[PDB]
Amino acid sequence: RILLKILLTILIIIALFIGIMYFLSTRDNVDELRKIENKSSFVSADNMPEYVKGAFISMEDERFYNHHGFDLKGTTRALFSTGGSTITQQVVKNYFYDNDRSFTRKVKELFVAHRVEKQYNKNEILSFYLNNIYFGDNQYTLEGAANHYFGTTVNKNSTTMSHITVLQSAILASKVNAPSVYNINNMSENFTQRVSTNLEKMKQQNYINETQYQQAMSQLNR
Ligand SMILES: [Mg+2]
Ligand SMILES: [Mg+2]
């Protein structure tokens, strides 16, 4: 009865912690995400070609639509197993914690992520994602980034502007979590290697066909 009381006390102190943590994450009001849709260059994911969405999904969260905010495989692999935040978690980080990165601010990010999943559908989440990540050059929306770097658009419907290519999609997708030193204006060999990996994942997961891939790989090498 002596090893049950020090087990209980530790088991309760952590539940107490987790609990307080919950209260911290509240809130952190996920209703706020709707503000992203007010950006002058907002484009929702459903108005983008499937290969544009797939560039990001295959590179950043290939099981995006499967999970409920937490990808277990990518989070165990994440615990330094030679990552690991799901696109949902990245939306929380990018909107609410544009500043800090602590273990406690990591626990409460989980609570908040579970909440955005409960309140938003996958397309909305994906749209919050692509309309609030840094693409360099002070560009925080996919469309801004596409306009700025390439003068192309990610709105499949659009007719006033050339359409973002497979390559360009991979470049912007690769940029999102690349080291800050990766410069789309002057891509290093390490950057072209990163996007080649991105392009390969799009092919492997079938967001693009061999021809799209080869043609992108070729454009990447000029
Ligand atoms: Mg992947
Ligand atoms: Mg995760």
From Swiss-Prot:
Membrane topology, from the record: Single-pass membrane protein
Catalytic activity: [GlcNAc-(1->4)-Mur2Ac(oyl-L-Ala-gamma-D-Glu-L-Lys-D-Ala-D-Ala)](n)-di-trans,octa-cis-undecaprenyl diphosphate + beta-D-GlcNAc-(1->4)-Mur2Ac(oyl-L-Ala-gamma-D-Glu-L-Lys-D-Ala-D-Ala)-di-trans,octa-cis-undecaprenyl diphosphate = [GlcNAc-(1->4)-Mur2Ac(oyl-L-Ala-gamma-D-Glu-L-Lys-D-Ala-D-Ala)](n+1)-di-trans,octa-cis-undecaprenyl diphosphate + di-trans,octa-cis-undecaprenyl diphosphate + H(+)
Record-linked Pfam families: Transgly
Chain segments annotated as coiled-coil in the UniProt record: none
GO MF term list: peptidoglycan glycosyltransferase activity
Keyword Cell wall biogenesis/degradation applies: yes
Record EC number: 2.4.99.28
Transmembrane segments: 6-26
Keywords: Cell membrane, Cell shape, Cell wall biogenesis/degradation, Glycosyltransferase, Membrane, Peptidoglycan synthesis, Transferase, Transmembrane, Transmembrane helix
Single biological process term from Gene Ontology: regulation of cell shape
Pathway: Cell wall biogenesis; peptidoglycan biosynthesis
One GO cellular component term: outer membrane-bounded periplasmic space
The keyword ATP-binding appears for this protein: no
Subcellular location: Cell membrane
Main location per the UniProt record: membrane
Classification via PANTHER family: BINDING PROTEIN TRANSPEPTIDASE, PUTATIVE-RELATED, PENICILLIN-BINDING PROTEIN 1B
Job of this protein: Peptidoglycan polymerase that catalyzes glycan chain elongation using lipid-linked disaccharide-pentapeptide as the substrate.
Similarity remark: Belongs to the glycosyltransferase 51 family.
Protein name: Monofunctional glycosyltransferase
